Symmetry: D2
Subunit: 116 residues, 4 copies
């Protein structure tokens, strides 16, 4: 599991469940190519997006579909989605956790990068 | 002037208006002594808490009354208040902006310190 | 005026100065068209990106060039940039402040929307 | 495990390790009485602070010793500590996770309250 996504809801104080997440990898022509996707679980987590073999160095984008999440709760949101863009680097063994904390008009995102 | 408080509401995307703020300063006996208080304006800001003369070196606590703010909006919040504790003016006078971004079950606080 | 960007540095407790910001607007063909750009001032603010006349309804993307900011300060950052995507002016004209609070491996963004 | 504390470092993108955490419970005389304490682990977590039996309804304070953490890293910080104050409420079964994300001049705290 080299890449995991965790989403929290700051209004309810809970995991953000059933949030759609789309991952893209930047192609040689500078376009975003679909890479992996899923929906967060009851724990607000999305595991098994990729493998160590496929997750090579590159520029990746994680799109978290926040607007659909808030609309389902009946809360008017600001953003279309949250976008997290970063370079994956082979500086020794690494695991990446992309965390996001959501509010209707604000979000925060943190990366937790560890040596397993 | 040397100490300002700014509060935003992350649910509405607006300044957090009429939020009560209490400032304390740690005394020689280690107790929290009342220092200043007020309420945020329509812009979510609270100015005029103190003066350069009165705002001496010390340990200060800025208590932002978040629970009362959320309850008045009909939203159940988690925290009793947000507490911001810091040493001020230990390298000479500075201007401090204590900013807070509020959600019902989360908040962030940042300090902007200028010379 | 109707669109302002404000950026703070959570490591230094200061405005984030000289941060490049690029704004795009989604076109009818679903592509991101350049809309405006600039750099934050000594106050961490970027004013004058657009006018009420030009800032019509649409989907906008505000790209804040965080990696270049951190690299210039000698700090290794995680993100390439912070991207803020939103629909603007769909219920008539509004004034938008896009605020961002930066750390090397984390950022937050908030919108303050006024009528 | 009704109460857990998790601390992250936003400068390094890592768990905040060996951070001292002190929990207090508000007494009848309005004073803060020591309740539990510990240091965050290699995962930035602090488990086993209390038990379901002892963790009754009340007002609690979680103090995270951020200044000592940053001083050890040689980074000048703003806050003396981060303080998280809340009422524990018996609205059915509950687990509380107090999360904190630390930067030298800013921190964020979130509560994740779940029904186990
Ligand atoms: Cl003042
Ligand atoms: Cl503008
Ligand atoms: Na994975
Ligand atoms: Na516990």
């Amino acid at each position: 599991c080299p890449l995991m996504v965790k989403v929290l809801d700051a209004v309810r104080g809970s995991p953000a469940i059933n949030v759609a997440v789309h991952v893209f990898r930047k192609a040689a022509d500078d376009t975003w190519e679909p890479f992996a996707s899923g929906k967060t679980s009851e724990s607000g987590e999305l595991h098994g997006l990729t493998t160590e073999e496929e997750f090579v160095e590159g520029i990746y984008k994680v799109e978290i579909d926040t607007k659909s999440y808030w609309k389902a709760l009946g809360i008017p949101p600001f953003h279309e989605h949250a976008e997290v863009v970063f370079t994956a680097n082979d500086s020794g063994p690494r695991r990446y956790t992309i965390a996001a904390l959501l509010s209707p008009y604000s979000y925060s995102t943190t990366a937790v990068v560890t040596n397993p």
